[PDB]
Design a protein around this nucleic acid. Sequence first.
RNA 1: ACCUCGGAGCAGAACCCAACCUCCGAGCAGUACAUGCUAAGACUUCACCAGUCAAAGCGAACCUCAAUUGAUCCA
RNA 2: AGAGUGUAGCUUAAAAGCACCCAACUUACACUUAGGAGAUUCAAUUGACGCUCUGA
Lengths: 52, 34, 141, 109, 324
Amino acid sequence: KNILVRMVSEAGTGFCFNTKRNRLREKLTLLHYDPVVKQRVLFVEKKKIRSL
Amino acid sequence: ELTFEETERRALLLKKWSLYKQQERKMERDTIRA
Amino acid sequence: VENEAVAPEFTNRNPRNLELLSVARKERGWRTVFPSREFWHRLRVIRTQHHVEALVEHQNGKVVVSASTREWAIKKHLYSTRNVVACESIGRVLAQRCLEAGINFMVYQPTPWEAASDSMKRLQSAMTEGGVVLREPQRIY
Amino acid sequence: KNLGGKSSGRRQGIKKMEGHYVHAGNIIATQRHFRWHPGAHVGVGKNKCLYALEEGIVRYTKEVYVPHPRNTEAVDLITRLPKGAVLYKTFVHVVPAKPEGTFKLVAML
Amino acid sequence: RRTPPLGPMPNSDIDLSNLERLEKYRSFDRYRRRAEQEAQAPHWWRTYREYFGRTQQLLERKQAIQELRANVEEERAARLRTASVPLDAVRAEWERTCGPYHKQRLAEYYGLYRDLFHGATFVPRVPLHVAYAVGEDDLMPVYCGNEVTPTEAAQAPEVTYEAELWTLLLTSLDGHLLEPDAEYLHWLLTNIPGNRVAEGQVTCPYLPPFPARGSGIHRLAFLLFKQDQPIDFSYQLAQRTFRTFDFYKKHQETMTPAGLSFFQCRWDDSVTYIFHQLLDMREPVFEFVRPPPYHPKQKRFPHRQPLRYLDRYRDSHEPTYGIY
RNA sequence: ACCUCGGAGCAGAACCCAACCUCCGAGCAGUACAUGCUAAGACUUCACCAGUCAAAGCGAACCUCAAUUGAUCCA
RNA sequence: AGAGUGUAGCUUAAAAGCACCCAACUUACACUUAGGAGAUUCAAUUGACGCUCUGA
Ligand SMILES: [Mg+2]
Ligand SMILES: [Mg+2]
């Protein structure tokens, strides 16, 4: 099973996007495009919105 | 390691073997058809 | 001024006019078939049993330029007409012919194995160093 | 014992037959499988729908089928085809009507 | 209903119960070759093309090839993939042997024949070496359709056609500013005495190319006619106008096109000077105008359409207030 | 027993067609984090709601899947 | 003695395309990549050098 997690930008911007990951995998870090910065920046998982 | 002379000799060896076995297969096929 | 009489709309009949302006259409379909038709000029390489052919062909099928190891001029200067040396030499000759023809860009559409082929790599490098870019400009809409 | 099967028809098929003037972006035909393959100036959507990439006249033709070398299933089919056999498929083309544009005298400098 | 085929259906002859016995395309390459051949072959069904479409020489060549094979260094380089080819010698031999045919192909592709001669073709048997002197040091050659700027073409070119009565004609095919079906004559040297060109009769003085700005790429052709027997020939644009088809219709019996060389030119500051000083006119500036975008007839109630629908049809973006 | 969704017959060939008719399935999973932003033109499950495809452009690199779902209000 | 006569294996190909072979990848084949050899029988459309058939 997977969970929906809010990945938050490490760029200081309050930009968040929801992704999915396995409940049994480590906390998730991605390089996602930040429109505010107009550049790919690191996003780190912050909270679990719901379990899907 | 190896040298240019032996490489050339090996290339000529492959060439002559190509010719020889080509003739071999040609004669074999000729006998087959005959 | 009589010399100033100019028609409101110009009619440039040069077939390569819009192609050089990067404005002409280039067939964008054929997504389920190979090779793609989305090009103005294509570099087509045919490796026969004995010879090597390199054509620059417009999308309409016209063979704009050709370079065959079957021509006396080229075949009288190389040992084998079916080897990597032959492919590189014919590529250089085709590059010169293309530059004198005015073709500077083309779309090469090799199969995976042809692209991996050493002879095709040498031919592409020969064209590149001769001054032909194997990547056509994007159309301007 | 038999449940389901109540789905309605997809209303798929040809939206523009041959000879129909078609503007850029118009959907020519919607299909579940590849019944009609994309021809010249005809693009395929994610769902295999054929849309006109240019403004022109739709023409249906039968053309030899040469799958992309990385299309493994089609390549295997071909590799198993007997010598001399050629596959054919129905292609949809949009013969563009208008020219890309015209050169107009803008200023007599 | 089943209407019978109007001809041999594809894959009909080969089809037979002996599929296992029949050999098969083991290679995508051979299948592609066969498919391309079939596509080229004509068909009775609607198709894409319908809508969008001596002994001494042999002996000498065999001896030369045998000599090249015998030369060990040649074989060494070939097997070491290091041998090269003399590009200049290859070019000269191409000119001598097969250059005319490829040049004819280039002319046909560029549409010179369909425009200069309304379709009638001819192999340019006689090589024609034209070069525009650049500076006092170098010179841009005009091979076939290459690009030469009007700045480079400012002064008349040097022509060296190896032969032993000729007429040379420079014609701009698509530079006409008033007539779609018309030419410009830039210089016409008639009754030239063989190789030397300075002795030709200057029927029309040299006028450098002047492709109008934003008018696209123009094509300029050097037509060389071998003249069987000498014949007499007959800055104002109306008289620089020209129809090579009619000219060759008049001079066909005594003339035969034996050399061809063309190049492509686009606008330049030299074109500006040509227009202002030599031609004494306001240079025309052309722009490529695409057809206006198509929008369906506006509906009173654009159901499900985005708010941009009204913007698609409004002409002025600035606010308007009607009676107020 | 069933109630929603999809595929195949009935419904042979544009589309659409009932049944407490015949059979299969779904209520996900996987990969990616540009599965980013915009925008012509179109399709549309016979209404609407909803659902689809998409040129060009900006910004970049150089999605698979038939179904795989649920409005408003309100939290 | 008479007839058909005649491009490397095949070509209503005109010095070409298919064929064919080893090397590497395959158990192997196949594919692919690298390479290899190759002919218009001899003299002026004609005659005579080689093959097949009809006889002794
Ligand atoms: Mg059904
Ligand atoms: Mg509807």
